[PDB]
Write a protein that holds these residues in place. Structure first.
Motif: not given
Ligand code: HEC
Ligand code: HEC
Ligand code: HEC
Ligand code: HEC
Ligand code: HEC
Ligand code: HEC
Ligand code: HEC
Ligand code: HEC
Ligand code: HEC
Ligand code: HEC
Ligand code: HEC
Ligand code: HEC
Ligand code: HEC
Ligand code: HEC
Ligand SMILES: O=N[O-]
Ligand SMILES: O=N[O-]
Ligand SMILES: O=N[O-]
Ligand SMILES: O=N[O-]
Ligand SMILES: [Ca+2]
Ligand SMILES: [Ca+2]
Ligand SMILES: [Ca+2]
Ligand SMILES: [Ca+2]
Lengths: 520, 75, 74, 520
Positions: B33, B27-28, B30, B22-25
């Motif tokens: 993948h 977070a979007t 899903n 939720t905190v890193g790059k």
């Protein structure tokens, strides 16, 4: 760092978006990559927007996950000569000044260069904004990446305090108007009603002050002009194209009802306050012929005059945003259909059309088009890698730079030198006929003042003006079209021979009338 | 075509992944993948794996969004 | 300095979004990005010459070390 | 083998030489390297020369101790096209013949080539000596070293028995006169009084028979034109330049009083019989802007006419040797200041200026000049060596051949291709405006015979002739200047737009007057 938003919450209202997003290849791509909608969600109702969400239109919104396509797109082809005036002996139209006199293009018309520069080149050309906009200095002309980042990061405005179109240097014109921008950017895609009609929800329209509009626009050729950002599927967004293909029912391939059916377009409309506002056209296939036809067509994007009575047709008329969607031999009829011409020649007084880069309509019916070849096969082919994931080159440029991928893969019988020689044979032949057409046009044009001064009758001069229309059309199509005949060599040859015939007919008419006057 | 999964439901049992994701790059990005967890989610409790979810180790799982790094690597 | 500075440097583009090369290979293939950016005083041939001076000297001593080990072994 | 002479014996008389020689970097270089003065020393008095000593003017006098600079200087750039006529569609001035009709340049005006050839090219051009001089055969055109060794080792004279200027072939002119030679050689430096005035001690002057003068001259661009042979310090020798900068007090940088003070010139005069004879200008700094301005300027070097009354101004007048030392926007005023124009146009009858290669005056005020950049930074940079003693390249040529040393060292943000693209953007834009200016000039010029024949009044034709002066000046500056706008792109653009405005004004005047005549 981006935090995802709850898309299901959006979809509660945005059912069209849900239907597209959940099914295509961007089903996993969160809205936050392109939209900042927090205050929007707090204030919208099912029919009222409330606070307007922010939408990213910059190309770097896509470059994060598609760096290869973005990097290929922004490449500058330095061999594509920049700011190179067409009205010179060594370029496309040696006698352009004489032939186009009376039209704004006489002030400057350069050859095209790489796509990264389209919006900045539109702003700085001498015929567009009276010289108001310039690069911040002459070094910025090289900065393709800068222009893509935003026109206003590389340009200056000579007078930020006024928004009128006026000349800032003596040999400029102020031909730019809001319709032009539709083929340079789609940053205004949510602020422009279909066709540029007046609309309560549109900030900009055909009748806007173009200098104020200009200042709101930043990015050239947005990635989403060909790719729906929600479904990732192939599309067009250009209103003039959707209008020709769909509203006027002409189809994607007007000469081929079958191909038009297999490779068609579905108009999708978005509303504001439950009234139609904007539209896109989803493509049945990823068909670059139709994608590139958003811009590489003959169009009206300007005021003009009626053929029937000579009266002014202004930006407020729908005709000021129009795709003729007609080849050179159907064009005169297409212009009669809307009762329109572009300018009166400064020397002959003839009503004349102004033609622009009609690559899509020229390509129709050619040997390559008839065999299912499309613009991208020659101008943006798949990259060939010894080891790697294949992707599509997005550096749209002459096939001379990638002959292995653009030609020789289909033409196994040829070496590169033989394929280049075939292209040059057509271009050399075609250019010779363009030069001969110009020679005959100029000879006619030179006779008008002699005839007027010898007292030749209006009736004879008007007959010659009617010939000038045709002599002009059948020539200018080919100096406007960028392949120098390659896209359709038989058509170029037939049309240029027609131009010469019309001029010769006009020259003979005028010489006989001048001689009769002198004999009396 | 991938269909996203409900990552929040995963995080009800995967607090350690939640704190990183939720905190890193990514977070979007899903979970679909790289993971096929449908039967896992149907059978698991916070204290019992149930069916083992599938995890992708192939480099193509990254190449979809990072083609330039991948293509440079495989040269 | 770290391995990536010489073996997987950033790509240099006239126009484009910078990314890190992941082709891990000798810096001889990308001397502009792997050496010459820090060693402005050198041409590519000079930097290559400096590498080869070290490798040539070292390889000579490896060969001599093998000669003496082999003599002992025999 | 050379034997040194006793310099102290010379210095007994030559106190100016002593003061220069003993202090500079040639303090150890003996007089015998350049002078043979034995009989001179035996016969001179402190005020009378007695027997004249021999002075070497050949460039090989310096090549003995400065081989690198000499070898760099004599290099031939084969890519600089030789004998390439400017009045053609593929060169600088496609409509030059129409526009320059009435002037000797109509007979031949080629693009410049390498410096080694300047004196031989001066002798053989069709506009100069009636075709009297030719290369010994067509192969000698390649021989740069030969030309440097001496013009007469590579040329023939069609008639050694006569010394009159006349045509030896029908399409030649005899425009050469003694002033021309000052920008091709300084072999005559001890035989020519300041400005070319009549003088008891001068063998040659502005009024000499130019064919006899020609025959005495051998070497192009002597090394001592920029370097004092006695002090080895930087200097100029060209009288016209010293006259502008010093006698007229305009300074080395007329737009910048401060830079003119920091980078100034000291006039030093040499006498004969205790009367002033010749002068040089020692530079405060090794400033190539001023060194190259000995030749790369707009000048008069020819007879002409007065603007006030139309009367002849001959070679005997000081105005026949004049540096205007004015940029394009101050030039008309500079020509009014001396009451002078060059020729009457053969078709329009207008009094017109003739402009020549004004690189120094164009460069003033440009971004590069304002930042302290000088001609040599781009055209003769330091050589870059991995291991070696650095020296200055003396092969003056386009920076395209040494972009690393001429541009990219200051422009670290660019690759070579990007820097070339920036240059071409300016040149392409500028050339397009030159072509448009010519188109409008030609259109005006074509109307003069029509107007005269329709009975338009002298008063209207004279108003149009006054416009022709300006339309011509603001165009011809740029076909004369060799950088195609690069040296000052904003100035080129403003001037070329002014030319077009003036022509359009003249065309409108003449068309309205012709139409009124026909209506009566
Ligand atoms: C990462 C978070 C993404 C952003 C931001 C964008 N796209 Fe994308 N795209 C993404 C993925 C994971 C995929 C699927 C890969 C696969 O092949 O399975 C895609 C796919 C596309 C496609 C291909 C669509 C198709 O073939 O049907 C296109 C044309 C595409 N994406 C374009 C695109 C554009 C124009 C964007 C900016 C508006 C963009 N994408 C953002 C991941 C991401
Ligand atoms: C409107 C948004 C456009 C679309 C869609 C496409 N093109 Fe284009 N093209 C456009 C402009 C305004 C220009 C000139 C840009 C400038 O600054 O001068 C161009 C240029 C080209 C060129 C010339 C490139 C060069 O190296 O000189 C080519 C080969 C080209 N365009 C092809 C092309 C193809 C194949 C397209 C569909 C994939 C396409 N263009 C779309 C405007 C627009
Ligand atoms: C899409 C139907 C277009 C409209 C409307 C406008 N332009 Fe355009 N433009 C278009 C293409 C496909 C190209 C490249 C091909 C070509 O032949 O030039 C261009 C190019 C330009 C350029 C660069 C070249 C030049 O003419 O100097 C400029 C400066 C430009 N376009 C300006 C312009 C203006 C001022 C318009 C409204 C009057 C305009 N364009 C409309 C596509 C389209
Ligand atoms: C129309 C003029 C286009 C613009 C603008 C952009 N792209 Fe494109 N893209 C285009 C075509 C014709 C194709 C090939 C479709 C086919 O199947 O033949 C593509 C393809 C993509 C893909 C898919 C993967 C690939 O083939 O490379 C992606 C991810 C994609 N394009 C992304 C992309 C981005 C990020 C753009 C803005 C820089 C972009 N496209 C512009 C046509 C057009
Ligand atoms: C291969 C069979 C082609 C297809 C399909 C299309 N074009 Fe083309 N184009 C082609 C050639 C061989 C040339 C001449 C290029 C040369 O270097 O001589 C062209 C030219 C262009 C240009 C001008 C490009 C330039 O010279 O820089 C443009 C703008 C262009 N073509 C656009 C275009 C469009 C929009 C097409 C689909 C409708 C299209 N081309 C098809 C080869 C081929
Ligand atoms: C590819 C880009 C991935 C995304 C997106 C997610 N996961 Fe993942 N996961 C991935 C790999 C390659 C591995 C193997 C371990 C490693 O560290 O590389 C994993 C592992 C897990 C595990 C097991 C951790 C452990 O206890 O050993 C869990 C519980 C897990 N992943 C969960 C998870 C969830 C809930 C995600 C969506 C928010 C998710 N992952 C994304 C690759 C990728
Ligand atoms: C698209 C759905 C993605 C998949 C699958 C993977 N990654 Fe990714 N990654 C993605 C985005 C949108 C971003 C942020 C881009 C930005 O700069 O904002 C990233 C970022 C990375 C980074 C940089 C992280 C940092 O802290 O700087 C790395 C090293 C990275 N991603 C690696 C990576 C790997 C190894 C993957 C396969 C397991 C992978 N990513 C999948 C989008 C997507
Ligand atoms: C630059 C200052 C370097 C750093 C930091 C690292 N290495 Fe290197 N490496 C360097 C040179 C000049 C060479 C010789 C290459 C040649 O072509 O002569 C090497 C060699 C390697 C190799 C062998 C590569 C090959 O010849 O193909 C490996 C496997 C290698 N280096 C690995 C490596 C690692 C893991 C590093 C960080 C700990 C590292 N190198 C640092 C230059 C530089
Ligand atoms: C260790 C040996 C690595 C492997 C295996 C992979 N990558 Fe990498 N990556 C590595 C380094 C040292 C860096 C640069 C860190 C820095 O900031 O200097 C990177 C960077 C990335 C990024 C960020 C964007 C960029 O800088 O290019 C991405 C998206 C990334 N790497 C992706 C990536 C993928 C998809 C891989 C498998 C093919 C991959 N990396 C392997 C080190 C290592
Ligand atoms: C050898 C016997 C020489 C002859 C013949 C010429 N020059 Fe010379 N020059 C000579 C020396 C030993 C030096 C000093 C070297 C040093 O740097 O200490 C010079 C210097 C010059 C300079 C530089 C002057 C300065 O920087 O102030 C110039 C421009 C120069 N010399 C030019 C020159 C010319 C034009 C000659 C022919 C007329 C010439 N020199 C002859 C040695 C010798
Ligand atoms: C008068 C003695 C001159 C001085 C001092 C300089 N130049 Fe010159 N230049 C001169 C002539 C007569 C010519 C033409 C010679 C011919 O035979 O045609 C030139 C030519 C040049 C060129 C063009 C060279 C080419 O390759 O075509 C350049 C770039 C040039 N000149 C530059 C130059 C510079 C930078 C000077 C000061 C260092 C300089 N010139 C002095 C006449 C004279
Ligand atoms: C210095 C103020 C000059 C005077 C006086 C003359 N010329 Fe010249 N010439 C000069 C330069 C700097 C150049 C090169 C730049 C250029 O634009 O040409 C030249 C060149 C020539 C050439 C070669 C080019 C050409 O015009 O064919 C010739 C044949 C030439 N010059 C002849 C010439 C004659 C006959 C002059 C007296 C009437 C004359 N020049 C004067 C600098 C100067
Ligand atoms: C003016 C048009 C020049 C002519 C003719 C000659 N040279 Fe020159 N020289 C010139 C400049 C602008 C410079 C550089 C001064 C600076 O400090 O930037 C030079 C330099 C020299 C030197 C000094 C050593 C060096 O820098 O190379 C020497 C020895 C020198 N020049 C010799 C030389 C000779 C022998 C010439 C006839 C072939 C010659 N110069 C002509 C300007 C001019
Ligand atoms: C770099 C900042 C420059 C300075 C300072 C000067 N000039 Fe220049 N010149 C420059 C360029 C980029 C060009 C065009 C060259 C090309 O190949 O496109 C020129 C051109 C000339 C020429 C004609 C050279 C040729 O094309 O062969 C001449 C004669 C010339 N320049 C002379 C000149 C003089 C005398 C200067 C000082 C007053 C001068 N230049 C400054 C770049 C630069
Ligand atoms: O010209 N006014 O937009
Ligand atoms: N511009 O068309
Ligand atoms: O023209 N006589 O020097
Ligand atoms: N010759 O100027
Ligand atoms: Ca082009
Ligand atoms: Ca049109
Ligand atoms: Ca030249
Ligand atoms: Ca002059």
């Amino acid at each position: 760092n981006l935090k995802p938003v709850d898309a299901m919450q959006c979809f509660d209202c945005h059912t069209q978006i849900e239907d597209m997003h959940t099914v295509g290849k961007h089903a996993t791509v969160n809205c936050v990559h392109c939209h900042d909608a927090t205050e929007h969600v707090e204030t919208a109702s099912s029919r009222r927007m409330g606070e307007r969400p922010v939408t990213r239109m910059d190309l770097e919104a896509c470059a994060t996950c598609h760096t290869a396509q973005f990097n290929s797109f922004v490449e500058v082809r330095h061999e594509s000569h920049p700011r190179l005036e067409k009205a010179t002996p060594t370029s496309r139209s040696p006698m352009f000044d004489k032939l186009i006199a009376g039209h704004g293009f006489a002030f400057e018309h350069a050859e095209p260069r790489s796509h990264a520069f389209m919006l900045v080149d539109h702003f700085v050309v001498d015929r567009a904004y009276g010289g108001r906009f310039q690069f911040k200095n002459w070094q910025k002309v090289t900065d393709g990446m800068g222009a893509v980042r935003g026109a206003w990061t590389v340009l200056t405005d000579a007078d930020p305090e006024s928004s009128d179109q006026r000349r800032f240097l003596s040999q400029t014109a102020t031909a730019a108007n809001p319709v032009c921008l539709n083929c340079k950017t789609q940053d205004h895609i949510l602020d422009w009603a279909y066709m540029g009609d007046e609309h309560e929800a549109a900030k900009w329209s055909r009748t806007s002050e173009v200098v104020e509009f200009a200042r709101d626009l930043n990015h050239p050729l947005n990635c989403f002009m060909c790719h729906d950002p929600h479904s990732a599927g192939p599309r067009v967004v250009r209103d003039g194209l959707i209008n020709a293909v769909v509203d006027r029912g002409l189809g994607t391939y007007p000469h081929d009802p079958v191909k038009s059916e297999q490779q068609g377009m579905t108009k999708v409309t978005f509303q504001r306050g439950r009234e139609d506002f904007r539209a896109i056209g989803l493509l049945d296939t990823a068909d670059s012929n139709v994608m590139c036809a958003q811009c590489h067509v003959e169009y009206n994007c300007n005021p003009g005059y009626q053929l029937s009575d000579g009266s002014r047709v202004g930006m407020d008329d729908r005709r000021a945003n129009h795709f003729f969607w007609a080849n050179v031999f159907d064009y005169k009829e297409a212009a009669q259909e809307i009762d329109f011409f572009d300018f009166r020649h400064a020397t002959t007084g003839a009503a004349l059309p102004k033609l622009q880069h009609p690559e899509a309509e020229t390509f129709w019916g050619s040997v390559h088009e008839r065999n299912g070849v499309a613009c991208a096969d020659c101008h943006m082919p798949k990259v060939q890698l010894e080891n790697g994931k294949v992707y599509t080159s997005h550096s749209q440029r002459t096939p001379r730079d990638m002959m292995g991928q653009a030609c020789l893969n289909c033409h196994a019988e040829w070496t590169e030198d033989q394929a280049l020689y075939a292209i040059d044979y057509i271009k050399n032949y075609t250019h010779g006929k363009i030069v001969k057409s110009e020679y005959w046009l100029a000879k006619m044009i030179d006779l008008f003042p002699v005839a007027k001064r010898a007292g030749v009758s209006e009736d004879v001069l008007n007959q010659a003006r009617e010939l000038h229309y045709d002599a002009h059309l059948y020539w200018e199509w080919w100096t406007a079209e960028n392949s120098v005949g390659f896209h359709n060599p038989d058509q170029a040859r037939e049309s240029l021979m027609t131009s010469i015939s019309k001029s010769k007919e006009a020259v003979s008419l005028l010489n006989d009338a001048i001689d009769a006057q002198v004999a009396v």
